[model samples]
Target: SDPKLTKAVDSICDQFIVTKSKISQLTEYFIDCMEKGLEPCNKGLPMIPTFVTDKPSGQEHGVTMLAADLGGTNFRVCSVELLGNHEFKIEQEKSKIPTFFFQDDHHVTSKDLFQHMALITHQFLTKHHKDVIQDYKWKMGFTFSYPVDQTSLSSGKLIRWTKGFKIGDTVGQDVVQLFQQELNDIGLSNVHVVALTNDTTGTLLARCYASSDAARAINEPVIGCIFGTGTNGCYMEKLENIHKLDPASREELLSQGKTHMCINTEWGSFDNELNHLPTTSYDIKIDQQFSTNPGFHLFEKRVSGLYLGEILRNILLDLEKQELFDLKESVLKNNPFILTTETLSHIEIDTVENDLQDTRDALLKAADLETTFEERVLIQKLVRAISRRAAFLAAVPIAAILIKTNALNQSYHCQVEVGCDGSVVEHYPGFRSMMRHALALSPIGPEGERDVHLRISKDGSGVGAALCALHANY
Candidate 1:
């Protein structure tokens, strides 16, 4: 590593590294966002009701349920059984090729997409159940990983699309109704739709399913946050207090004591009024690079794995303009996504890590660009800095929720766990430590009370959604 490049990269890290003060401020603001969002008709955050879990295991008995997570381009359907005693069994994800939907922002429909999923569900059931289908009245959990406005446990009216989807007639329509229509049409009337779980909420619930002890030991609003390919988060909230509910529903919710609900905190759209977040010139370029939805999901683009590699590209070009690095032979400009987030991960892969020869070779291959050893060192710093920023930034809300819910502060022998899952958490090294460090920097009341744990797990939506289904009778 050249001393010149090393100094330059170190200086840039000064800007990206999150300060403890910023983390503290973010916590205060997060609580404010929730308070405002829960107010009557305020437009801060969509504290959308999850209706399945407050913390975990709203049901004390086991149920064999069919569950699917409609979060990504790849649709995954699975069978989940949540037995009592913190014991749950989730089968391995099936197939190398999953059924894909919303390949692009092209026009699509709920009918077609749901029908395809219903057919897939039927196949899944047929393969697993060697008995009469009519014997079991299957409760199906639909974990729709999108923004919604809800009226019941199993239904929600779609708000404008995100995640680059443009399904016609979906906006302002009940997703459950559309999915149920497809199920009924496809001879799945026996399969009843019970619950709608958000990706984040489902993740927390899945963790609870696998470890009921955690649910008993901890509290709900256990958030599920994703940081790779895209970004979002959700937590459980009291249903009656969520003022977004209609008058009648709010009245009904007040009538029921101990109502467990999950609230979708679509934090990616945070600071969309362009009020917060430290946006840079390179970030602005990435925002405009896409024509269909310019200036959309501004925060997501700024600090998510989905856009980090692209951010690196823009920064590299800017550095060239400043003569920071001579990029006369740079090939990054030839393609939109010359280096993916996975490629960036190679730099962080380690065992007494070096200047990363593997990363250097991969960068040259991915971009077919010439590089100096010093340039490789710069590349390493850029990857670490961007991912570090993302990790710390993403942890802000989590730390806030823990503090706000009193999950982080006070009490003797204090202990609470955050159930987390995502590609960024799984693949990227140092990401978890950065988030944990930020949490440590949070205003946790006491050293002992700072005993919070982020329990990492896998396939949260499948089992979490199913568990949400089992509790849907409420």
Candidate 2:
């Protein structure tokens, strides 16, 4: 029998189809870009030195330090003490600062933000400094999760803000300097800025650091990735490929002509033109209503978990307005924001005997909506289809990076550890499985044989920040 809800389910499924096809196309284009020798640049920043050979050794350690992970929503601080032989004991003796403090019209200066961070760090240091096993100058690693125009190891100019930050003062200043000056004003002693890095860059560095220590015969390149509220990637590239820098570039003079640098690709804003991406009616509408501009980040808009449930909600709203389904009056007239990704997750993974009842209670509590069993079933199917496509599309960039780097060449079977950090990838159902399946479609060996091992590193961003700090002077 034809389900009365087929039209609604089909509308959702159509988005999945579009996402899958678009991801496939993106993968192909990424491969072509690499093959054509088009050096990818993150604005004018060079890619990081990611090859195993470029990794640094010599801990000379026996030191205690602070590490901070600043993100769009929270600020996390930890105390790490190098024990010996590349093993460190980490203590998270602090609380995260809410991101709302940085929003404009909220009345918080950049200095105020750092003062809050300093107070937290100072409090942590006072409590933990006495327990230091070895007495070395306290070095700190700041893992600032934002887009910045980097000029040196310890300095960068803030570009336009993302992650809901609209601090007018921070949009064009050197972030590291601002923080340093603030720390000085606060008289925070025993703290030196050793590294300033994006979360993605830190993830790559941390992975390589751990892999090298683990004795895994690490030769393949490492790419640190983030998929939380937003998305971005970092990898190593030869310095010669960077043609935009001055011939007397500071790195060249300081490193004695060594041409390896760590770079962050603010890829969350990748291909803003939407020329190579696939867009659906839902995607177009998402941009039309929500985004500052349309036809940008088409890939992220389609696949990212942050936007997936919103996509589903918009479609359901349209259906309700059209009176296409016999939805309960409450469901039909609910606030859109109330139908969140969490609700969709629960509905799609219906395992209980009275699943519809559970969903109804949840919806009423969350979105003030009522639903019939048939409607619940349709919603579940719709969300599943949407999630599946997101996972599949997320794999395209991974596959493209591998193919472009020749990491999957016929002679080598490389293990690519993707350091993924984000609620979308971490909590999204079936997302990892779908990504793996899509990655397997890429050709590698002779006769187009597939050969690659893709693994996810849970602590990529936090740990990567530490590694980036350790190698800041490199």
Candidate 3:
């Protein structure tokens, strides 16, 4: 209600504002980092080459394949039937991985983990595809969401574990072999692990497999991005551009009729040196006080759903200390991340004009903080500002990828399609439009923005895995 409070809030919001010129500048820096990352680089983005050579043309059909997803929280097994005409049928079972299996203090072996997955897969097969499991040997695509050093399409050694997985023996071991051995020991030797795919690469393949004839004829899918709890993407890159590969490996891939490779651009670690990125006081507090691995995942800390909520929390606490709200004895005052992105979305989209009741309810549910109408308005303003900054920054990597792949043409004849998944991309209000605004502000201009398409891709870790199995056989 007071002008002084509005002035203070606006000053804080100003730090989160990013302009069109800044977006263009960041895109240039991002492209430079990506180029350097491909040449044995350190401390920037990791342009890791995924050996996936091609995306689906949607020509093959009538194949039922098994797909397995082993991520941080859950394990999913699905039997996907590829029907012609860009359609598919799927049946799946999901089970949460017990915490003790991967918790740091728990001493679980790699055998224990794979054996658990094999058992789950066996049950899924018996439950949904019993006849098929008995008659046909299954081709399986395994989507393992962790860092792995891939040498080929079907094999990768575990580089290290993140996401709370602490399997010490699995480090430097080929995960495909480990899972295959477990399947064999369980008398399910027919379940051949045909390919190993990351979630982002699988999203790219999945979109291509499911795109309609009209969409494929016009906008071709080339990149897949994730903007949820973590942010990353995979895009097609020419084999010649991957200079880190040995000469023999390049020759081997070329002999296999591969011209390009899908690159898992771990762009979350982009700009670790903080070059060209704007950092506010909230960001500094997040990095120093709240982050699990401070000074790492520099870009993700600014863009992903996992940290946006924390950023807001720090801002709210600082404002509370300035005597803006009565949060002195509330949970928000004491808790680190009692605030969450889900709640932020609710707060941002609240439209109840009757005393702003929806936002008040959201705040109460989120952190048990009672709020006045002016305080709720201030909170919503900050939420929108933070989200807008995230959407704009998210476009930087997409623009860089477009430039690196030469998708933008002088004649405006090219169509670039990006398949995106994750909560923030799917549910965050007005996020895609902000990203498009940033894209228009880039070197590609408005005409380039019209040619680019971004669509939500469902089940990248499940259906995409099945497509990977199909690609392996092709």
Relative to the true structure, how large is the alpha-carbon lDDT of every model? 0.70, 0.61, 0.84
Stretches off by above 4 angstroms in model 1 are: 1-11, 57-62, 91-107, 212-221, 246-251, 328-330, 349-355, 445-449
Off by over 4 Å in 3: 132-135, 410-413
Model 3 score (lDDT): 0.84
- Model 2 bad stretches (over 4 Å): 1-4, 18-21, 31-61, 84-86, 96-103, 130-136, 212-215, 218-221, 247-260, 291-298, 326-336, 351-365, 410-412, 443-451
Q: Candidate 1 or 2, higher TM-score?
A: 1
Question: What would the per-residue lDDT of candidate 2 be over residues 1-474, giving only the tens digit for each residue?
Answer: 125457657766765663445556777765554333325342212233222214434242565556877666566777665554545677765475665665567776778777777777666666767554234466677777666766666777776666566566777888777777766666664466767777777666555555554444544435677665467776554566544445467365447746455556555555555657656677787777765434445556766666777777777777766667544655434444456666666666665477667666766776566767677777777878877777766776677676656555424444445667667677766677666766765443222223444445555445555555664442
Question: In model 1, what lDDT does residue 216 have?
Answer: 51
Candidate 3 residue pairs in clash (backbone atoms < 3 Å): none
Cα misplacement distance, residue 396 of candidate 1 (Å):
1.0
lDDT of 3 at 34: 82
Tens digit of per-residue lDDT, candidate 1, span 284-339:
77788742368666767766777888878777776776667776565887577677
TM-score winner, 1 or 3: 3
What lDDT does candidate 1 reach at residue 86? 66
What lDDT tens digits, residue by residue, belong to model 3 across residues 1-474? 867778888988989999888988898898888888778536556788778887887766888889899887999999888887778889999999988965668788999999999999999988987777656779999998777888777899998776667788999999999999999898789999998988999889889988977877667887999999889999988888899878788899899888998988888888988878988888888888887667777788888998788888888788777876568456876688788888888777787477778778877888788888888888888898999899989999998889878876733366878899988988988889888988898877788888888899887987788888886762
For all predicted structures, in order, the TM-scores are 0.89, 0.84, 0.95
Ranking by lDDT: 3, 1, 2
Residue 243, model 3: Cα distance from true site in angstroms: 0.9
